[PDB]
């Protein structure tokens, strides 16, 4: 084994390695080994797209297929070890550190895309639709939206609609009954980590945020068929996003008010992208909770009846966040392995 | 390939080789300028030179004198070529990221090290005790730090800094000894006062009881031999000087004692890791070398913490060099050889790689 192969094999020995961890590590190794191939960039793009959509089974299958196709350059023993490790990884909703890091970075990238060529007309019209949706007891001081800050403020102020206007959508929903969030009020905890990254998780020195209090949310383990239990690849920051039903109501008013808009689908996708970026970056929800609200059968029917094709904020250029998450994965795995070795060394020393 | 471990403190730079159990070169972190002199040479020529401290409160503020300190460490103290040794450096908790970037840039472009790593001093102190989770009180010479560490990561949201360390205790001891009629106003007098602080001062379990005993009896009075043949007696100052750690108001500081800052750090952490922090309280630094400081910390934290909580204070005898000991343990590990930021990685990524590799 060379130095790179030995480093990869040691990182794969990380006891808390999950499917995202494995995908990132093996993609980094395959880029460093077979990256010179002409067809590799297509494979890397497909793997990154699978990872963004949390299609971890498909990503792992594609990675294993590539490894078997290059079993001579890599090594039969190494490929066999990778195959064995592929079936040994799982996902913990409470502990997906690489996924939380990647989702924070991808929310930041979504925000960067949003700020470039920002169209304020879309969110002015969304504010108008919000004014014709919200009840009389909810105030709205956003008379006009001219900047990305005001649009994000309106997105975040959509939370005053909860339990009033989206109740019908939640009742019609078949997956919201599987939402598993503890009713217990655990208070707030301090953090220096951005977005949905856990407070105690390691972070890059340039990635920390000013210390702030965030709500402590637990999983309802007593729930039967809970969303977190059913979908463990999704990092549990909260349960299914109920405020996104309020967003869907506001978007219904938006679409019925702009049925003749030629770029209606693009505007709705822009709004959904801003919603996802704001909710991941503020630590309210992970990507798949919001997106699975958008993927509900009756919500999908609502969006299909308006001739709207949602892209679910999926972008085709996630190379930077993917590689940074790979570096974060390598750091965490190597640090844990070294911690094992250091604990053993000091224990044997004394 | 021998790794250099260099712990740069505010008052003492401790440098040596990985695998050794003691810093081969412990010298004052001072730079004398009239060409410059670094370390014991600048201290000896105190009158002729102007002394400057490149590190204050554990943070490097003057990078030129820091470069001089590192050059003296590599060539004039360790007598090794920096280009053939991976140099593991140490940094203060909550160190600015620009400082880490400048550190790696100076290591790679000025000294041409083949590899380097930067680690938090408190994390290395915890490593020296064989722990990855626990709260470390690292009181050196310029600053005191309460650093809770979870699985090798120092939690930025719960670390606190108390501007109270050995320098303040030495100044307070000078003030009290002046209150007794002993004139200590010069730099040599400062050094001999620091010697008395190291040799005689201790932490009292009960400060009021110790003060009452000193007022009543004379059992706590100890004799010390001054450099100029004089013999001076020190009484209640043996525990009054270190008590400023637990009662900063002795020097007019509005902050809280080290026990209270420790409790505040533990409270700033999640309730699920508070038990681990309470059970792993690691003392580190020269200012933690006072006799009885561990017992006093245990008593005060037991008073502050919930009654059912288990509190263990870890104060190894070598806790003065625990940062360097942990660094030497780290840099001599087989799994650590891949964490070295190599010259190729620095060239392809720039200094910012320190945030991605040293975290
Ligand atoms: N046995 C001792 N008893 C009391 N104080 C001591 C003892 N030994 C050293 N000190 C004091 O501890 C300080 C040195 O501690 P240390 O070397 O850990 O600090 P440093 O690394 O220079 O500082 P920093 O806090 O910035 O990391 C000096 O002020 C010294 O006088
Ligand atoms: N716009 C917002 N402002 C403040 N908190 C929010 C917002 N949206 C969601 N949250 C919080 O996110 C968590 C999940 O809410 P929901 O998305 O309605 O399931 C709850 O703790 C909410 O209070
Ligand atoms: Ca120190």
From TrEMBL, chain A:
Swiss-Prot/TrEMBL keywords: ATP-binding, Nucleotide-binding
Record-listed ATP binding positions: 156, 162, 170, 176, 179, 181, 183, 241-243, 279, 284
Signal peptide residue numbers: none
Superkingdom, taxonomy of origin: Bacteria
Protein name per UniProt: Substrate of the Dot/Icm secretion system
Residue sites binding AMP per the record: 156, 162, 179, 181, 241-243, 279, 284-285
Species: Legionella sainthelensi
Residues of the full protein shown: 3 to 352 of 537
């Amino acid at each position: 084994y060379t130095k790179i192969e030995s480093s990869l094999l040691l990182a794969l020995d990380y006891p808390k390695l999950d499917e995202s961890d494995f995908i990132l590590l093996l993609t980094k190794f395959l880029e460093k080994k077979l990256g010179n191939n002409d067809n590799y960039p297509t494979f890397s793009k497909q793997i990154q797209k699978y990872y963004l959509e949390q299609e971890y089974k498909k990503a792992i299958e594609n990675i294993l297929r590539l490894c078997q196709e290059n079993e001579t350059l890599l090594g039969t023993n190494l490929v066999q070890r990778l195959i064995t490790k592929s079936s040994q990884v799982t996902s913990n909703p409470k502990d997906n550190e690489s996924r939380r890091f990647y989702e924070v970075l991808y929310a930041e990238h979504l925000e960067s895309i949003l700020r470039k060529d920002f169209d304020c007309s879309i969110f002015d019209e969304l504010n108008e639709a919000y004014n014709e949706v919200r009840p009389e007891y909810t105030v709205n001081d956003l008379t006009k939206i001219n900047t990305f800050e005001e649009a994000r403020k309106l997105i975040l102020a959509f939370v005053m609609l909860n339990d009033n206007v989206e109740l019908g959508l939640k009742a019609q929903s078949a997956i919201y009954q599987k939402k598993d969030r503890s009713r217990e009020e655990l208070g707030q905890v301090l953090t220096a980590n951005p977005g949905i990254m856990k407070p105690n998780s390691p972070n890059f020195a340039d990635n920390t945020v000013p210390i702030k209090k965030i709500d402590k949310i637990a999983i309802d383990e007593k729930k039967a068929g809970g969303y977190s239990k059913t979908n463990p690849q999704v990092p549990f920051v909260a349960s299914l996003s109920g405020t996104t039903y309020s967003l869907v109501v506001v978007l219904q008013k938006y679409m019925d008010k702009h049925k003749t808009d030629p770029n209606l689908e693009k505007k709705i996708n822009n709004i959904v992208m801003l919603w996802t970026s704001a909710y991941i970056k503020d630590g309210y929800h992970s990507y798949k909770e919001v997106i699975d609200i958008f993927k509900d059968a009756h919500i999908q029917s609502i969006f299909a009846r308006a001739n709207i094709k949602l892209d679910y904020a999926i972008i085709d250029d996630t190379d930077h966040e993917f590689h940074r998450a790979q570096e974060y994965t390598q750091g965490i795995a190597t640090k844990a392995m070294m911690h094992q070795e250091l604990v053993q060394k000091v224990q044997e020393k004394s | 390939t021998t790794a250099l471990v260099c712990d740069n403190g505010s008052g003492l730079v401790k440098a040596g080789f990985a695998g050794d159990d003691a810093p081969r070169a412990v010298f004052p972190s001072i730079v004398g300028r009239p060409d410059s002199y670094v370390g014991d040479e600048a201290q000896s020529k105190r009158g002729i030179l102007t002394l400057k401290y490149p590190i204050e409160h554990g943070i490097i503020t003057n990078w030129d004198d820091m470069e001089k300190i590192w050059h003296h460490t590599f060539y004039n103290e360790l007598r090794v070529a920096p280009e053939e040794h991976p140099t593991l450096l140490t940094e203060a908790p909550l160190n600015p990221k620009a400082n880490r970037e400048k550190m790696t840039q100076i290591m790679f472009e000025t000294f041409n090290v083949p590899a380097m790593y930067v680690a938090i001093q408190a994390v290395l102190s915890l490593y020296a005790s064989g722990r990855t989770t626990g709260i470390v009180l690292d009181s050196g010479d310029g600053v005191t730090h309460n650093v809770p560490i979870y699985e090798g990561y120092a939690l930025p949201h719960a670390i606190m800094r108390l501007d109270l360390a050995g320098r303040d205790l030495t100044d307070y001891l000078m003030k009290i000894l002046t209150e007794r009629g002993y004139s200590f106003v010069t730099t040599a007098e400062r050094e001999i006062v620091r010697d008395i602080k190291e040799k005689l001062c201790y932490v009292a379990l009960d400060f009021e009881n110790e003060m009452a005993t000193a007022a009543s009896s004379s059992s706590l009075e100890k004799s010390y031999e001054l450099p100029d043949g004089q013999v001076i007696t020190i009484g209640n100052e043996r525990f009054r000087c270190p008590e400023t750690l637990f009662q900063p108001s002795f020097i007019g500081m509005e902050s809280a004692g080290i026990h209270e800052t420790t409790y505040n750090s533990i409270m700033k952490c999640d309730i699920d890791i508070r038990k681990d922090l309470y059970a792993n309280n690691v003392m580190s630094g020269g200012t933690t070398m006072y006799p009885g400081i561990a017992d006093r910390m245990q008593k005060e934290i037991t008073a502050l913490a919930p009654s059912t909580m288990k509190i263990k204070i870890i104060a190894p005898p070598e806790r003065k060099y625990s940062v360097w000991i942990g660094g030497s343990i780290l840099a001599s590990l087989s799994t650590f050889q891949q964490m070295w930021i190599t010259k190729q990685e620095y060239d392809e990524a720039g200094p910012s790689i320190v945030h991605r590799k040293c975290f």
